[PDB]
Paper text:
Malaria parasites have two actin isoforms, which are among the most divergent within the actin family that comprises highly conserved proteins, essential in all eukaryotic cells. In Plasmodium, actin is indispensable for motility and, thus, the infectivity of the deadly parasite. Plasmodium actin I is abundant and expressed throughout the life cycle of the parasite, whereas actin II is present only in the gametocytes and mosquito stages, including sporozoites, the highly motile form of the parasite, transmitted to the vertebrate by the mosquito. Although Plasmodium lacks a gelsolin homolog, the mammalian G1 is bound between subdomains 1 and 3 in both Plasmodium actins, similarly to other actin–G1 complexes.
Residue numbers in the entry:
A (entry chain A): 5 to 38, 50 to 373
B (entry chain G): 28 to 149
Amino acid sequence: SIALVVDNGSGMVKSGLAGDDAPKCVFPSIIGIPKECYVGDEAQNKRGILTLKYPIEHGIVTNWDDMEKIWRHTFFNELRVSPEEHPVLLTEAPLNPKTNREKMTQIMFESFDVPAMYVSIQAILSLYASGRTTGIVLDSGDGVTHTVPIYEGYVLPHAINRTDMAGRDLTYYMMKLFTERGYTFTTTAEREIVRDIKEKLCYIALDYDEELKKSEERTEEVEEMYELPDGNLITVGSERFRCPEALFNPSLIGRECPGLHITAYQSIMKCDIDIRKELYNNIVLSGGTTMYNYIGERLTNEMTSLAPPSMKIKVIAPPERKYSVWIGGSILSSLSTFQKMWITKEEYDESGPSIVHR
Amino acid sequence: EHPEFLKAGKEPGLQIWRVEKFDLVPVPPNLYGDFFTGDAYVILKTVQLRNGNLQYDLHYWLGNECSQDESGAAAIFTVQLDDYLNGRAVQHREVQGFESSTFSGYFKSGLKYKKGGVASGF
Ligand SMILES: Nc1ncnc2c1ncn2[C@@H]1O[C@H](COP(=O)(O)OP(=O)(O)OP(=O)(O)O)[C@@H](O)[C@H]1O
Ligand SMILES: [Ca+2]
Ligand SMILES: [Ca+2]
Ligand SMILES: [Ca+2]
Ligand code: NA
């Protein structure tokens, strides 16, 4: 009390205080190199003089020096909070390597002098946030998409699937689609423009072949104008649904891995048959890339066509989908029973970074 | 250790807690079965096996007007209480008006509902 909640992602950092409705400070997980030194949005504005660095790739920390800088910026510049005076809740990807779990614990205690910390699996926090202890979470962010079967509060690690296609790949796909139109979005800022185009204008086609026919005939019923920062207008037509379609058919961008629905189906099949029924009934979407309109209905139809006859399929798509991980964490670290769940400074000093394991 | 966990599953019977501002608070026995539709509850049913051991069924009940912190806490409390019971409890998610026959059978005169409840912890 009061616990700090930090959800570290491949592209975005979700941070705030335990007991809040939402994260108060949401900023990109980027380091700007003209060490570091520019961190956050300030590395996006003065990006013309710097080169961008991402300490987290596909949900996994690959640079601990830069990661440690993101944390310092999170505490000092964003939350404006002394970390040695607060317990800190962190998040990790499913199947996170133990070396990174120990390094994360080491940094918090040794570099930040944190009184107490705890690490939660992201998918689990999302399920909790939806008010469930059992279900299959489809976490889909900027750098990685995870399919996590969870039973009675614990992930089933052998059934977890991972695909490295996500939001960033979709952004580049849209850039590719705009390239064949004559445009040349290539720079740092230009990539950010297209990303905004994707978030604002895109949607999931219920029937892709039918929508593709519709856009080629009644084109006016799909076309939307987008105002570029220079004032010019670009027409966006079939790109609106062709871009997020790659989530269901990755072959569009030249990937061999199966689509979102197939990968979820195979995870369910890797689970005990006695729980598959409950998993179909509790499919929970999380992450920014699951925000596309009509994605819940599309997935629902896809899963039904794969599932056994008369199987009940429910896809839950919470409006706060982008922050479900943080929210689940805020609730978790606010509970009266979580006081004794923390890993204390005392427990670290006589066990080391190997303390995270239980 | 949370004092309510220590009271949990000591003997055959029915135990009900209501989530109140990020905490588990025991419902007074005379109010068992009368659920605030604006709240979330945790219910432990303990049954003596025919061999000395105890049987555990954990039911978390979600009112239609309960807030996200309450429903979230109820699910988390359920896992934590199951952990305390060495994972030997079977967990059940109960929705208002769609409760399982087992959960309904716990209350002889049937489930009652009433508007209102404790305010959100958020
Ligand atoms: N309204 C929206 N529609 C479509 N996509 C969106 C929307 N909002 C955000 N996104 C996408 O979500 C991605 C980031 O989401 P999120 O923060 O959940 O992932 P992350 O944690 O940063 O990355 P990862 O989870 O892969 O480590 C971005 O690529 C962004 O394009
Ligand atoms: Ca994430
Ligand atoms: Ca309430
Ligand atoms: Ca159990
Ligand atoms: Na179900």
